Amino acid sequence: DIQLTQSPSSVSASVGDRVTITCRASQGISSWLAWYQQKPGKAPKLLIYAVSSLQSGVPSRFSGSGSGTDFTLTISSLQPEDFATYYCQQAKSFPFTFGPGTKVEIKRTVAAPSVFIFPPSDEQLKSGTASVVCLLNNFYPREAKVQWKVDNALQSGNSQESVTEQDSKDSTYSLSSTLTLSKADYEKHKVYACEVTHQGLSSPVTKSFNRGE
Amino acid sequence: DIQMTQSPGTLSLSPGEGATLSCRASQSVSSSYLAWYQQKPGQAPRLLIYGASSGATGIPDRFSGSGSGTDFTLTISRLEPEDFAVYYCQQYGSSPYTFGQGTKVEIKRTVAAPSVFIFPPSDEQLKSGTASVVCLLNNFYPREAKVQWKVDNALQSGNSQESVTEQDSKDSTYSLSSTLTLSKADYEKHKVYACEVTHQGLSSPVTKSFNRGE
Amino acid sequence: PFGEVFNATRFASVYAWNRKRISNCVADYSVLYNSASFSTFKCYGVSPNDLCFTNVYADSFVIRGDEVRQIAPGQTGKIADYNYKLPDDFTGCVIAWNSNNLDSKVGGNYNYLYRLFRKSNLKPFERDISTEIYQAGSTPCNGVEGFNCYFPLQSYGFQPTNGVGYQPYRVVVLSFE
Amino acid sequence: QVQLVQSGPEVKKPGTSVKVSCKASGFTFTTSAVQWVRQARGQRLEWIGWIVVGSGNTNYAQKFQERVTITRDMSTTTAYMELSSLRSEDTAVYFCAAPHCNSTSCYDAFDIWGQGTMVTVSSASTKGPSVFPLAPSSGTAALGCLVKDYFPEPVTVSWNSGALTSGVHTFPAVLQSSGLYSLSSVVTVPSSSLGTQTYICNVNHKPSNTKVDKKVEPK
Amino acid sequence: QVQLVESGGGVVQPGRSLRLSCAASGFTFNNYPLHWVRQAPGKGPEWVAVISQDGGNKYYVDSVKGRFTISRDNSKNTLYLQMNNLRAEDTALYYCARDVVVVVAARNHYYNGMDVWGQGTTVTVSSASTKGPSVFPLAPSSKSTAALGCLVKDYFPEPVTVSWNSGALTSGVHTFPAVLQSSGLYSLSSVVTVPSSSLGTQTYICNVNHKPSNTKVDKKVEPK
Ligand SMILES: *[C@@H]1O[C@H](CO[C@@H]2O[C@@H](C)[C@@H](O)[C@@H](O)[C@@H]2O)[C@@H](O[C@@H]2O[C@H](CO)[C@@H](O)[C@H](O)[C@H]2NC(C)=O)[C@H](O)[C@H]1NC(C)=O
Ligand SMILES: [Br-]
Ligand SMILES: [Br-]
Ligand SMILES: [Br-]
Ligand SMILES: [Br-]
Ligand SMILES: [Br-]
Ligand SMILES: [Br-]
Q1: If we measure between CA atoms, which residue out of A157, A155, A139, A138 comes closest to residue A147?
Q2: Under a CB-based contact definition with an 8 Å cutoff, are residues D74 and D30 in contact?
Q3: Minimal CB count within 10 Å: which of A10, C5, D149, D184?
Q4: Region Immunodominant HLA epitope recognized by the CD8+: what ranges (chain C)?
Q5: C8 — contact with chain A (CB < 8 Å)?
Q6: Hey, how many other C-beta atoms are within 10 angstroms of the C-beta on D19?
Q7: Which residues line the pocket of ligand 1, CB cutoff 6 A?
Q8: CB of B83 within 8 A of CB of B19?
C-alpha cells in the first residue's frame, strides 16, 4: 500500500512565478507517477503522466521530473487559471493512491478580518436551541483562530467552523464559526464573546454581547 | 478507409478470349501493395498477382497485371476453362486492408431456355402436415430467370424460396429450383397448382401445372 | 564498487546494455556465490575465486527469466542473436536475480525493450540501438510501418502477475581480460 | 508443405463466443503476419483484421472493432480469432492468410491461405433431414429428392451410390424461417428408363449421423 | 466528444445498496479499462476500483472489498458499480474515469492514470430523515459597514440554495459550506456586508430553497 506525501501543503504565488511541487513515495515506483489539477466543484484533470509526459492540451509551462521515490511538478510562469489543488498519483500497484494535495493560493497583502458576533434569534430560542455565530469577513492569509468564551470561560467541543473558497475579486477568505448551546445552558450565562487572533491583528480582537441587551 | 471497387460485375466471355478486369481505389495506393486473388466455389482465395505486376509462384504466365495509383488491371491473355471463377483485388498498404466486391468470369453461351418440371408434394410429406411443391428450371442461359406460383389462378407471394446452381462445367448453363410451401390444410383447399417461368429463351412465359389428385 | 552496479535503482534495456569499467579495486565474489538472492551465478573459463586479471567489465541489462539461459557462450535466441552475444571463448561470469518487485508494473512496464528483428546476428559484445524500420519484404519501407515493415524494438510489458519465466530479471555480466 | 490449417466447423448459439484456430507449417511463423477474412454464403470477402506474429500488434476493421480480438501463440505456431456475442449475422466462413517467410525475410503478399472455417450461429438444434421423393411426371423426364428440415449444414447427396452422375443437379440449400435448411437434388433421365431403372438418392448428414437411401418411384 | 456521464447516486440508509452507472461516448469503449474514483467532502480523491477492457480483471480498494462489484456492458458502452452494505464513510462524489494507455513500440500498457473523468454522482449514506431547514435571522447590530445574514440550520440532505432579495442582491454575499452536525443534519450560514446607513432604509430577505423536502423559506432580516 504505497503512501504518497506532498510538500508543501500550500503555496502562495503570483502570476509569473516559478512553482515547484514535490511528491515522495514510500517505495520506489520507477516512472509510474501522474499529476492532476483540481478546481473547486470540478473533476480532477490529468496534466502529466509517466513522470514527465505532458497530457494533450496541457500548456508546456507545466513540466515534471523524478525517478523512484522523489518527483517534481514545475510551473514555469504561473497563469491565472493555474491556481488550484494539485495531486500526485502512483501507478505501480493497486490500490492507486493519491497524494494529500498541494493548494496553489493567490499571494496578496495581509488583510485583517472584520469580526461580527450574532446572538441566537428569538424565534430559534423558542425552539429550545441557541446558536451564536461569529463571522470573520474578508481576511488574508487563511490562517485564523476563533475562541469562544462564555462568561470568560473558554469553550471546546461545542463549535463548528466553515471557510469560504478564496474570493475571486479580492483574494480574501471568510470564516463562519457557530457556537451551539441548549436554551438551558444559554440562559445560565450573560457574556458571549469570540476572540479572534489573526496575522493582520497585532492583538486578539474580541466581539462580545450581553444576553438580552 | 480506402474503398476498392471492381468492374465488371459479371464478365461473360468465351474460352479462348482475352479477359480484362479492373480494380479502382478511392485514393492513390502503392502499386507494390495491391494483389489479385482467384476463388472457385467451395475453395479458399488463391493469390495470382501481387505488387500490381508481380506473378505469384505457380501462376501461369497468361495471368498478367498492370496499373498504378487508383486504377489497376488484371489481364488474361487467353482464357482457359479452369479460369472461370471469381476474382478479388485487395490493397494491403494502408490499414484496413480492404477488398473489392469481386468479378465473376463466366463462360459466355447462346440463349438456352429452361426445361420446366413441377412436382406435387409426396404423399409421405402430406402425412406430416406440410406440402412442398417444387418447380425445376433445368439447364438455361443466361442466369436471369423468373418464377411465379399460381394456385387456382391466384399468384402467390412470400411463401416460396429459390436456389440456383453454379454454371455447369460441361454445357455452361444454370438450373433453378423453387419451392412453394403450404400447410396440408391450405393445400387441400385448392386444385390447380402451377409455376409460370419467364426467361429470355422463351418467346412467352411457359406454365407447368398439375391437378391436386389426378 | 559492486554495490552501485548490482543494487542500482534502474537498469538498462537489453538492446541498449550498459557497460561499467572496473580496473584494479576491492572485490570479494564469495558473498555473491553464497547468496540465494542471485538466481544465476555461472562462470566460464574460470571456476567460482581470488585470481587476478588486468581489467573487469560490468555489463548490465534486464531480460525475462526464460532468456537468462541465453546469456552464455554458444547460445541462440532473441537475446543472444539480436541483443547481447557472448563469445565462445568468453572468460567471466554471468549473474542474475529476479527483479519483479522493481521492474514489473500492474498493467505492464513500458521501459524495458528488446530488439525483435535484425537482418544479421550480433558480433560478440556488439551493441545495436538503431531504431530503423525493419524491412521484412522486398518493398522498401520509407520510414512508415506496415505490411512487412515492423518496428525493430518491442516492449516486455512486465507484470507482477506474470509467470516467473516471464518476470523481469536483472543480469550482470563480469568479463575479465 | 507450407501449410495453414484452420479449425473445424462451429455451431454456436446466439450470444456466445467462438475461437477459430489457424496453425502454421513449412515456414517460420515467428516473422510473418496473419490476416483474417470472412465470407458470408454467396457474398464478397470482408477483411476483419491482421496481427504481426512477432510483436502481436493488431489492426482491426471498423465493423469488427467491437467483437473480434486476434491473438497468436508462437510456441504452438498458431493464430486465433475470438468472436464474442455471436448473432445470426455472424454466420459465415472465416479464412486466415499469411505470407511465408524464412528466418529473416518475407513474401510480399498473402500467398498462404487456410482451408476456411464455417461458423453457424442460430438457436436451432441438431436434426436429421426428412427425404421426400420428387416423382417423375406420367423423351426425357426429371426426378429427384427433397432433403427437408435439417440442421446444421451440410448434407451430401449422391445418386445410385455414385453410379448416376450425368444430369444431376444438387442445389445449394436455403435457410427456412423455421431455422432449418431445405435442399433439393434432381436428375434428368430418358423417359424410357423409368420402368426399368431404379433411382435412389443417398442423403448423408454427418452432424446427426443420418444415412437415408430413398428410392424415387414413378406413381 | 469524449465524455463520461455517471448517474444513480442518492441517499441510502446504512447497510442498504445502490447501483451506479456510467455512460461513455466518443471513444472505443472496449479498448480501455475503466476506474471508479470517489472524493469525500473536503478530502482528496480515492481510487475505488478498476475493470479491464473485457471485464476479466477487477481490482478494489480494501475498504470496499466484498461489498462493491464493478462491471461493464461493452454492448451498451456502460460501466457499473454495485455498492452493497454501505457505510457512512462511503459518502462521497463518485467519478468514473478512463484508463491511461501508454503506447511504446506499438504495444499498449494499461493502468497508468485517469485522463477522462465524469462530472461525478453523489451518494449519501445516512439514517437521517429528509428535513427542510429552519431559517433564522442573523440581525445586524446597532452600531457594530455592517454584517447580517441567515442561519440555515438542521436540514438533510444536501444541498440548499440561498439567494438574497430573490437574487437581486449579490454584492458582498458569503454563503458558507455546510457543516455536518453530530445529529446528522446540516447547518449553513449566508451573510452579507452592507453600509450601516442602509439598515433602516433597505429590506434584506434571504431565500432558502431545499428541493428534497419541497420547501422554500424566505426570511426578512431586520434590525432589532
Ligand atoms: C530468406 O529469404 C530471402 C528472400 O527470399 C525471397 O522470398 C522468398 C519467399 C522466395 O520467393 C525467394 O525465392 C526470394 O528470394 C533471401 O534473400 C535473398 O537472397 C538472394 C541470394 O542471392 C538474393 O539474391 C536476394 O536479393 C535476397 N532477397 C532478399 C529480399 O533478401 C535470404 O537469403 C533467405 N535467407 C535464408 C537464410 O535462406
Ligand atoms: Br524503482
Ligand atoms: Br445570567
Ligand atoms: Br473489406
Ligand atoms: Br495490440
Ligand atoms: Br488489461
Ligand atoms: Br463484467
Answers
A1: A155
A2: yes
A3: A10
A4: 109-117
A5: no
A6: 13
A7: C 138; D 100, 102-105, 107
A8: yes
